């Protein structure tokens, strides 16, 4: 009944802002299981709703890795929605802040990489008969 997951984003500073992009970072938002497993056994698709400044702001992934790589210059909230192969099982929605800018302690070491990830657990209190292929 309990499937653990890690979700969030990693990001890296270009080092110098790009001149006709304005972009300063490469980043990846993602959902992965806590340990290796094929989520696609039970995940139909994962939706990432990105900031509307992006094109095709709704990004749907149907096969792992459930991740999206992109470039940008601002921080914003990403809505991650996980739909299951049985539609009668309720989808799981997570909210994540795409983090790009590091703290001052970390700027002064000169770190180019930030990561903002969180462990979570998808709970199936009384799963579908079919959902017992989990
Ligand atoms: Mg670094």
From Swiss-Prot:
It is found in: Nucleus. GO terms for molecular function: histone binding; histone H3K18ac reader activity; histone H3K27ac reader activity; structural constituent of cytoskeleton. Changing residue 54 to A: Impaired binding to histone H3 diacetylated at 'Lys-14' and 'Lys-27' (H3K14ac and H3K27ac), and subsequent deposition of histone H2AZ1/H2A.Z into specific chromatin regions. Keywords: Chromatin regulator, Coiled coil, Growth regulation, Isopeptide bond, Nucleus, Transcription, Transcription regulation, Ubl conjugation. One of its GO terms (biological process) is regulation of cell cycle. The record marks 53 as: Interacts with diacetylated histone H3. This is YEATS domain-containing protein 4. It comes from Homo sapiens. The lineage of its organism: Eukaryota, Metazoa, Chordata, Craniata, Vertebrata. The chain holds residues 21 to 154 of 227 of the full protein.
């Amino acid at each position: 009944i309990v499937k653990p997951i890690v979700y969030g984003n990693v990001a890296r500073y270009f080092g110098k802002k790009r001149e006709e992009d304005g972009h300063t970072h490469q980043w990846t938002v993602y959902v992965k299981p806590y340990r290796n497993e094929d989520m696609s056994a039970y995940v139909k698709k994962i939706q990432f709703k990105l900031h509307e400044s992006y094109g095709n702001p709704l990004r749907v992934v149907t096969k792992p890795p459930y991740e999206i790589t992109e470039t940008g210059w601002g921080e914003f909230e990403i809505i991650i929605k996980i739909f299951f192969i049985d539609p009668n099982e309720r989808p799981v929605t997570l909210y994540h802040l795409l983090k790009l800018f590091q703290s001052d302690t970390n700027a002064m070491l000169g770190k180019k990489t930030v990561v903002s990830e969180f462990y979570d657990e998808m709970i199936f209190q009384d799963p579908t008969a079919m959902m017992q292929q989990l």
